[PDB]
Amino acid sequence: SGAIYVGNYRVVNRHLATHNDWANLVWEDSSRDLLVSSTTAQGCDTIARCDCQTGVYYCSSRRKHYPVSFSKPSLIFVEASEYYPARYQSHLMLAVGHSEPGDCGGILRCQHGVVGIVSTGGNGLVGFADVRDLLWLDEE
Numbered sequence: 001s002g003a004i005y006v007g008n009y010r011v012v013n014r015h016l017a018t019h020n021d022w023a024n025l026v027w028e029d030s031s032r033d034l035l036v037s038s039t040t041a042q043g044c045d046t047i048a049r050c051d052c053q054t055g056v057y058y059c060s061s062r063r064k065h066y067p068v069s070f071s072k073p074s075l076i077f078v079e080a081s082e083y084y085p086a087r088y089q090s091h092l093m094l095a096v097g098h099s100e101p102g103d104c105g106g107i108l109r110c111q112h113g114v115v116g117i118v119s120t121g122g123n124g125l126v127g128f129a130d131v132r133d134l135l136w137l138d139e140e
């Protein structure tokens with residue numbers, strides 16, 4: 001579990017969005033596994049605006065942050081998980097690391113701020129849904 005709290009936005013994995021998220025919906029994309037809802041209180045996170053390929057992510061199933069190198073966001077085939085079938089996911093970055101279903105929502109961060117959230121796992125990789133292209137998160 002986990003979210004990004006930027007401005008008056010909450011960014012969550014679409015597959016973990018709540019009824020309140022859907023009732024306060026800003027934007028969602030199944031192909032990216034992302035959903036954004038509106039919040040009453042402003043949040044503490046800053047979104048990275050960069051093309052870094054190195055950062056640190058939080059792994060809840062290890063209670064640990066790990067430094068990783070990761071691929072640039074792309075359209076990638078993802079094998080079946082507990083929460084999605086085997087399918088293509090867009091805007092997905094991969095690193096070598098540990099990721100189980102409940103790790104979804106852990107933050108990946110670089111020197112510029114939040115890069116994305118854990119979205120995929122298995123076979124010794126962790127996949128992250130990028131948010132650096134969502135420039136509208138920084139205003140309004």
Ligand SMILES: CN(C)Cc1ccc(C#N)cc1
Pocket residue numbers: 080081082083084085086
């Ligand atoms: C449970 N396994 C059969 C894979 C899977 C997991 C979740 C969903 C959804 N929705 C679809 C398929």
Ligand SMILES: [Zn+2]
Pocket residue numbers: 048049050051052110111112113
């Ligand atoms: Zn960066």
